Tab-separated table of C-alpha atoms and ligand atoms in Angstrom:
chain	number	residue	atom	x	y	z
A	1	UNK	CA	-0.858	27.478	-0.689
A	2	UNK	CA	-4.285	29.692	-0.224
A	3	UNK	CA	-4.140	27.842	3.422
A	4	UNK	CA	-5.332	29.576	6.347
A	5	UNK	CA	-8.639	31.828	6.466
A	6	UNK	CA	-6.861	35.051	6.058
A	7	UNK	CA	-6.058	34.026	2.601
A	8	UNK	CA	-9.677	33.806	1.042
A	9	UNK	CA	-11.433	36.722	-0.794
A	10	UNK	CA	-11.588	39.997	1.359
A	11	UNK	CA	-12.194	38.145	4.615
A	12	UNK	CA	-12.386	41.113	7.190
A	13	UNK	CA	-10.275	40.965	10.514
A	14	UNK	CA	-14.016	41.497	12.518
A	15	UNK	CA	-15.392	38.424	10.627
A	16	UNK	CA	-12.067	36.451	11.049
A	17	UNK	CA	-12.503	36.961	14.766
A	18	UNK	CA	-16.207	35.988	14.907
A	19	UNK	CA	-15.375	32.432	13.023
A	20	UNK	CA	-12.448	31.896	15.836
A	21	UNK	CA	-15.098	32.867	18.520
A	22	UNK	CA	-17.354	30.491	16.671
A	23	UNK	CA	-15.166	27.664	16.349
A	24	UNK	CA	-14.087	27.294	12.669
A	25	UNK	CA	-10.836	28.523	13.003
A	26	UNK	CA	-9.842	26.182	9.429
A	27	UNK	CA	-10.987	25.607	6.170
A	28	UNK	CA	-11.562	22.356	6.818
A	29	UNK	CA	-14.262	23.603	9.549
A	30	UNK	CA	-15.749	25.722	6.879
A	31	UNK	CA	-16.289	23.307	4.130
A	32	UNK	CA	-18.176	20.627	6.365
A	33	UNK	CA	-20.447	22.952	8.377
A	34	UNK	CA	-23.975	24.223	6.785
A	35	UNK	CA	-24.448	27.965	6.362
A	36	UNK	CA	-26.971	28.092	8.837
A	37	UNK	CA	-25.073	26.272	11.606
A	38	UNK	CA	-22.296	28.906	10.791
A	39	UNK	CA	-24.597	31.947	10.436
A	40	UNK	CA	-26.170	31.312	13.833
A	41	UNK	CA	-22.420	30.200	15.597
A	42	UNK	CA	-21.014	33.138	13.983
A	43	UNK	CA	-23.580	35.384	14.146
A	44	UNK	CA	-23.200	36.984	10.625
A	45	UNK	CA	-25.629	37.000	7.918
A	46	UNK	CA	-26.705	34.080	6.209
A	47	UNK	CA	-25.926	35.011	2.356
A	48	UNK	CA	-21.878	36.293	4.135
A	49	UNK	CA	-21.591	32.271	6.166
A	50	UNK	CA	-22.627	31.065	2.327
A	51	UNK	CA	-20.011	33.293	-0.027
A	52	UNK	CA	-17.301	32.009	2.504
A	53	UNK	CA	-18.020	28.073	2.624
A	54	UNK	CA	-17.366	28.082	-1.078
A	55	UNK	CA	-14.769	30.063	-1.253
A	56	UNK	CA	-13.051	27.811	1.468
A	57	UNK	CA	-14.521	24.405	-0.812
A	58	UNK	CA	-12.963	26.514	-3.815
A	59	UNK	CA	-9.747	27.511	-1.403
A	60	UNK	CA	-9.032	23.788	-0.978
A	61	UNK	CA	-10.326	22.000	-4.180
A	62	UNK	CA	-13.657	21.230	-3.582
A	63	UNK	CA	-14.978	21.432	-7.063
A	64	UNK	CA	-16.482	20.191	-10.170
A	65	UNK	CA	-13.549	18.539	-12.327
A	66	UNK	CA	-13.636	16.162	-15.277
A	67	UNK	CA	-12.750	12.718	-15.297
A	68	UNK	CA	-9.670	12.952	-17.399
A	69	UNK	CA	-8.404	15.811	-14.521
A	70	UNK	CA	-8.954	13.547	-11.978
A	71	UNK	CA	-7.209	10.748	-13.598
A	72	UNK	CA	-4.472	13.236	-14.514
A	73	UNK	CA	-4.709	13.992	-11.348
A	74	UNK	CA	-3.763	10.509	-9.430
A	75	UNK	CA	-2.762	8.400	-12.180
A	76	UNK	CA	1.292	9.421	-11.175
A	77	UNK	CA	3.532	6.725	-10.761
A	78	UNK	CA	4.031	5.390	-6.947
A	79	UNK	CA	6.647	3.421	-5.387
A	80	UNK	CA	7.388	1.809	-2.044
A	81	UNK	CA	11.080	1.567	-1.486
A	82	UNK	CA	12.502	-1.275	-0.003
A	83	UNK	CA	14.993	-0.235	2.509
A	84	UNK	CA	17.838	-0.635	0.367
A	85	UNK	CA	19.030	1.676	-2.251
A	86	UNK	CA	20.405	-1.572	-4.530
A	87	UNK	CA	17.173	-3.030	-4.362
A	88	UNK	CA	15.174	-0.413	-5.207
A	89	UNK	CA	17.487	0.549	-8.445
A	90	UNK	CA	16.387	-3.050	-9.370
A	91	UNK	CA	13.351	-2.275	-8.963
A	92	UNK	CA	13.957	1.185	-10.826
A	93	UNK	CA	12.644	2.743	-7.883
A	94	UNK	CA	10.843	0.317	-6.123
A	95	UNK	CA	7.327	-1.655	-5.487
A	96	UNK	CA	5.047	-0.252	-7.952
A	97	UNK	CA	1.529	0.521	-7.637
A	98	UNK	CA	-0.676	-0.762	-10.237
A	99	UNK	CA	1.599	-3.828	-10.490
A	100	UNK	CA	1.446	-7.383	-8.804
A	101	UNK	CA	5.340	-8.061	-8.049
A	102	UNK	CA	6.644	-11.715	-7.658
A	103	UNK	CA	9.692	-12.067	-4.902
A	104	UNK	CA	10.617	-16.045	-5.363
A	105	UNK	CA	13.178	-18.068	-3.190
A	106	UNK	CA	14.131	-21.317	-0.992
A	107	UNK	CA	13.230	-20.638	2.780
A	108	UNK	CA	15.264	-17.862	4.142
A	109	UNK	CA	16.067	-15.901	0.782
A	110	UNK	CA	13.947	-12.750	2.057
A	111	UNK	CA	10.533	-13.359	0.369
A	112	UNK	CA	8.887	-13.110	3.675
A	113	UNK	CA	11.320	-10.823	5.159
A	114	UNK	CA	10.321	-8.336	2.454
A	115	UNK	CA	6.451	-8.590	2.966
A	116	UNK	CA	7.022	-7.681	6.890
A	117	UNK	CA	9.196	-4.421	5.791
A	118	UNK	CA	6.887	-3.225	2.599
A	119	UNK	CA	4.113	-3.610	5.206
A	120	UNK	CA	5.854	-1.079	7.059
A	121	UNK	CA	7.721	1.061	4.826
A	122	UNK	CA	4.398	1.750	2.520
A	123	UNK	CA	3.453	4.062	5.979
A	124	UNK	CA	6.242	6.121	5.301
A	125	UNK	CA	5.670	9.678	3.386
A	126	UNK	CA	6.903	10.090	-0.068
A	127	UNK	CA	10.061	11.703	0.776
A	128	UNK	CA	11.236	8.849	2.810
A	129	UNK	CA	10.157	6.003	0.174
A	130	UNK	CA	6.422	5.337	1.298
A	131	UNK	CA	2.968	6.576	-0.073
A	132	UNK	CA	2.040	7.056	3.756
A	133	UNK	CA	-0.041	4.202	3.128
A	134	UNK	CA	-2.117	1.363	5.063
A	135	UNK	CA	-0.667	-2.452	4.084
A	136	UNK	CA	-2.667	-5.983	4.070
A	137	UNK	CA	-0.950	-9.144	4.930
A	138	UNK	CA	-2.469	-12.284	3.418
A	139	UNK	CA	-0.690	-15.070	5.651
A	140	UNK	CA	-0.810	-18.695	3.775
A	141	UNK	CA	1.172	-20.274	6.554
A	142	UNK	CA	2.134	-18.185	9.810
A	143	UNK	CA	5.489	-17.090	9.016
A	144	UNK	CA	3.676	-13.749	9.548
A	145	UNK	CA	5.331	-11.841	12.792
A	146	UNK	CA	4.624	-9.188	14.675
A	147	UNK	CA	7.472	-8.956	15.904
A	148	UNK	CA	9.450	-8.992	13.026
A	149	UNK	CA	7.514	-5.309	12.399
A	150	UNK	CA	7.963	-3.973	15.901
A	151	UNK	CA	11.701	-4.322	14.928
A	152	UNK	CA	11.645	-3.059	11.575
A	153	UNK	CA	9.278	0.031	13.047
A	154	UNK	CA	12.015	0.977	15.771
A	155	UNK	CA	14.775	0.703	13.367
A	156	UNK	CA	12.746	3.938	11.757
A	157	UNK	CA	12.274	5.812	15.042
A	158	UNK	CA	8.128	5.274	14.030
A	159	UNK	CA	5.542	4.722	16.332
A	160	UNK	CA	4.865	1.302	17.179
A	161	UNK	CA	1.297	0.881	18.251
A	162	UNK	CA	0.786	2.726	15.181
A	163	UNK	CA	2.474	0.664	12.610
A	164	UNK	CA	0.938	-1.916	13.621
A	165	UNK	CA	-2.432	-0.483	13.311
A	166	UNK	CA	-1.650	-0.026	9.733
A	167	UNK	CA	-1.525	-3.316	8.902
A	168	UNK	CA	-4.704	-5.555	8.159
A	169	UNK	CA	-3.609	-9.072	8.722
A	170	UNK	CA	-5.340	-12.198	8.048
A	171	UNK	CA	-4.834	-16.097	7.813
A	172	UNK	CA	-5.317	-17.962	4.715
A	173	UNK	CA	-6.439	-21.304	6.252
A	174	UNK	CA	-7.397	-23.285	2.822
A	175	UNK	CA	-7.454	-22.320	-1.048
A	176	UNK	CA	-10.956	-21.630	-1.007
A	177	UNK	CA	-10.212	-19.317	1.808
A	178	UNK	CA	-7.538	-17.726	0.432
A	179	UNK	CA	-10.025	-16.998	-3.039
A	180	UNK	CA	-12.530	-15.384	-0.092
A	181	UNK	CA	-10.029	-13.013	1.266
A	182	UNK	CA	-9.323	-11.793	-1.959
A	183	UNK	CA	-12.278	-11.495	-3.802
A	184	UNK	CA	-13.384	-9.417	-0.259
A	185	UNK	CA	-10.388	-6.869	-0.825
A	186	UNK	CA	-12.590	-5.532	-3.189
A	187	UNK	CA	-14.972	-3.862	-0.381
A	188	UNK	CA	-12.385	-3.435	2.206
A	189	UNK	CA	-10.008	-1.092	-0.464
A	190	UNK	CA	-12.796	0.823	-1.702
A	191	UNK	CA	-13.923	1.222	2.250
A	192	UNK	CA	-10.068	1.992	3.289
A	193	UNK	CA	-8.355	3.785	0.112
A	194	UNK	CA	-5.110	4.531	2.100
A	195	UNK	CA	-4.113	0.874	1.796
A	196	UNK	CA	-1.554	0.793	-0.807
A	197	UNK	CA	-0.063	-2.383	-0.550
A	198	UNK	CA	-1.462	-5.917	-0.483
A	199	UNK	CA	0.775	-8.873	0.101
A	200	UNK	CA	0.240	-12.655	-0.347
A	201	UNK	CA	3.244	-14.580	1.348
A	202	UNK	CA	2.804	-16.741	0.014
A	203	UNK	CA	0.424	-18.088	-3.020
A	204	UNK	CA	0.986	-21.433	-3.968
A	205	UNK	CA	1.354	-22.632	-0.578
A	206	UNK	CA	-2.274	-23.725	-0.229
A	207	UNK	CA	-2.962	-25.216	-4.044
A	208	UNK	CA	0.218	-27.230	-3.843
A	209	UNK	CA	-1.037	-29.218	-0.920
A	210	UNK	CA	-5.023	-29.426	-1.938
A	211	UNK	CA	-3.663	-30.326	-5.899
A	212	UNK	CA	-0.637	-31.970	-5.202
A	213	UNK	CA	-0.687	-34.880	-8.273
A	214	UNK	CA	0.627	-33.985	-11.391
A	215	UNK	CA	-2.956	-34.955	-12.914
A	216	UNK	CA	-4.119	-32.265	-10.165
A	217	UNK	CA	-1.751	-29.533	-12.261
A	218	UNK	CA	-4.406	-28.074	-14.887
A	219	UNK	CA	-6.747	-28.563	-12.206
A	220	UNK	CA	-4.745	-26.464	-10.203
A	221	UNK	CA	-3.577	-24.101	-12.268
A	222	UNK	CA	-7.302	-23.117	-13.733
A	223	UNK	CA	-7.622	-22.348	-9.889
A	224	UNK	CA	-4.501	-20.090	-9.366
A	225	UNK	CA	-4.823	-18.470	-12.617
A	226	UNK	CA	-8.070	-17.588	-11.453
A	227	UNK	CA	-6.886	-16.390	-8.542
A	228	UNK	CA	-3.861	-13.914	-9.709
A	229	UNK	CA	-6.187	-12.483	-12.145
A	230	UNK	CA	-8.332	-11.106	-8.724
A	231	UNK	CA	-4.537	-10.086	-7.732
A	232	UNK	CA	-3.914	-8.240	-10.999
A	233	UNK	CA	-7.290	-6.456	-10.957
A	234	UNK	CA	-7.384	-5.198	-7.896
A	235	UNK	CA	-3.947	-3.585	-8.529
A	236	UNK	CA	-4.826	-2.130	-11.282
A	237	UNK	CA	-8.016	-0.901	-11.124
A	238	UNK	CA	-7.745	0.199	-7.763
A	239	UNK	CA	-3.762	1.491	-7.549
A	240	UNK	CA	-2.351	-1.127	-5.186
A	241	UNK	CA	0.769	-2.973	-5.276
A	242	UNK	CA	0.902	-6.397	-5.048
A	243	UNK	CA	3.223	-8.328	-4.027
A	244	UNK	CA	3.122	-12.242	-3.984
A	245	UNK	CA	5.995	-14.533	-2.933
A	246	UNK	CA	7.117	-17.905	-3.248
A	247	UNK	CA	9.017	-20.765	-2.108
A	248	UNK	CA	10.534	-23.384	-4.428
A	249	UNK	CA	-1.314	-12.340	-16.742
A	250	UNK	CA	1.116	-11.164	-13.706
A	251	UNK	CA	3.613	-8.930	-14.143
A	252	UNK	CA	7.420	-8.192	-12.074
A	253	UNK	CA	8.968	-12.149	-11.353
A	254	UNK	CA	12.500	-11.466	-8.973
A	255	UNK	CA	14.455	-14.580	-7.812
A	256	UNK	CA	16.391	-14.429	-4.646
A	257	UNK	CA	19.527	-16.521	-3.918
A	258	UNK	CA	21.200	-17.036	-0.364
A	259	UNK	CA	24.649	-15.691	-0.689
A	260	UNK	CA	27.265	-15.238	2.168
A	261	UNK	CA	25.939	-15.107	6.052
A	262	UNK	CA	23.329	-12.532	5.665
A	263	UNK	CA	23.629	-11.158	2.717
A	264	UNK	CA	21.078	-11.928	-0.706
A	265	UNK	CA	21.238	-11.509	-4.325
A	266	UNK	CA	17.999	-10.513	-6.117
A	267	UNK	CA	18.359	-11.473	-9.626
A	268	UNK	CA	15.185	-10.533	-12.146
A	269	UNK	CA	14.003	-13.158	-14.011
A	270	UNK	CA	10.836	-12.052	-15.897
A	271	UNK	CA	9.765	-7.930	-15.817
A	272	UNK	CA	10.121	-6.746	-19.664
A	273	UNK	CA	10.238	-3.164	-18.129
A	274	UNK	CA	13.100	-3.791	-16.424
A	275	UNK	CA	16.890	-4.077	-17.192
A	276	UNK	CA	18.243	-7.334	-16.936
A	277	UNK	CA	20.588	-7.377	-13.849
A	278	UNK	CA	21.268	-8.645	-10.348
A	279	UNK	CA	22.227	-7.396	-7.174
A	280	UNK	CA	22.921	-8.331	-3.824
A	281	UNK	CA	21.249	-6.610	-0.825
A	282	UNK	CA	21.163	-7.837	3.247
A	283	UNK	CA	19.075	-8.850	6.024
A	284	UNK	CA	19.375	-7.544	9.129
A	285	UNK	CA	17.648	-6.999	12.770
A	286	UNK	CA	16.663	-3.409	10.863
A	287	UNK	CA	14.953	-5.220	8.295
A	288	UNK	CA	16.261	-4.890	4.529
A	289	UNK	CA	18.962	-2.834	3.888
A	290	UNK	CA	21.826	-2.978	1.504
A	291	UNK	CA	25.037	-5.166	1.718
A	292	UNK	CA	28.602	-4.358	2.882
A	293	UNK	CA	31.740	-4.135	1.479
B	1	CL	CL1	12.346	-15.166	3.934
């Protein structure tokens, strides 16, 4: 919009030159430097370096705003798409911020496969179905690969390396580890605010073996309800989207059926929001896409 420094109040050409010569060819270069860093870089008056630096901070919108405008401002639905158009019409649009999202299945249904290609495809910019977001991967058991990304990141002509440095990744070793991590994604979000996406592949994993009696199940379950609460906050209160999976206060359940060769059907089970069908999408050396015929 009112971009470069031409655009801001009456600039004159001989000043324009002396901020090149000086360095602060941007905006951006403006609004962090002091006045009398600029004034003496510049060599202009001190009161001129002043009037500018705000009206670059006011150029971009460096500024006083309420609360409200600031929640108006960012409080926009967001979704991550899922590399297949089926899928995400589901989904009615995709992974939602703000919202923990349940993907449940036997082995092999795509749970995991879908963690691996969120992770990626939250990096994306809007217009290609990502928030151009950062991703954490909560790993309960080491299906977690690296490889399975590298593939998924080619299959988008996207920078490797990159992608990869997108993605925080940790092992869950133990319940009580896995209650750790997430009660510490509390300081890592608020230090990193470009990750948009956590994922726990997946939950039950560790409280099944540690409470495995059927006396151990309120004992258990006192523990995991703790647990997706953390989840649920963190979503919410800091505009994440979570997803959990499974083998076999939330929010979004999907089930996911093996149907024929590599093809899957994600049915919704429990998401109020949501309308009540299934559909059948694929897995492929890509990553998730839709089916064929
Ligand atoms: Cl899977």
């Amino acid at each position: 919009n009112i971009k470069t420094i031409n655009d801001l109040p009456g600039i004159s050409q001989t000043v324009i030159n002396k901020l090149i010569e000086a360095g602060y060819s941007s905006l951006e270069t403006l609004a962090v430097a002091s006045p009398q860093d600029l004034s003496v870089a510049a060599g202009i008056p001190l009161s001129t370096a002043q009037k500018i630096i705000k009206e670059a901070r006011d150029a971009l919108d460096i500024r006083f705003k309420t609360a409200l405008e600031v929640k108006k401002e960012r409080m926009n639905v967001k979704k991550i798409s899922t590399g297949s158009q089926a899928l995400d019409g589901l989904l009615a649009g995709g992974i939602e911020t703000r919202t923990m999202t349940e993907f449940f299945g036997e082995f092999g249904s795509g749970k995991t496969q879908l963690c691996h290609q969120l992770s990626v495809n939250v990096q994306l910019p809007p217009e290609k179905g990502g928030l151009s977001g950062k991703a954490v991967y909560i790993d309960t058991e080491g299906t977690f690969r690296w490889e399975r990304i590298e593939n998924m990141a080619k299959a988008l002509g996207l920078d490797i390396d990159n992608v990869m440095n997108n993605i925080y990744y940790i092992r869950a070793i133990n319940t009580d580890h896995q209650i750790a991590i997430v009660d510490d994604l509390q300081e890592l979000v608020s230090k990193d605010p470009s990750i948009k996406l956590i994922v726990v592949d997946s939950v039950t994993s560790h409280f099944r073996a540690e409470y495995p009696g059927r006396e151990n199940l309120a004992v258990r379950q006192q523990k995991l309800n703790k647990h997706l609460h953390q989840l649920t906050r963190l979503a919410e209160v800091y505009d994440i989207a979570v997803i959990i999976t499974n083998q076999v206060v939330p929010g979004i359940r999907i089930q996911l059926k093996k149907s024929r060769g590599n093809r899957r059907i994600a049915r919704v089970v429990d998401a109020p929001h949501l309308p009540e069908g299934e559909v059948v999408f694929a897995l492929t050396e890509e990553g998730i896409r839709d089916a064929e015929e």
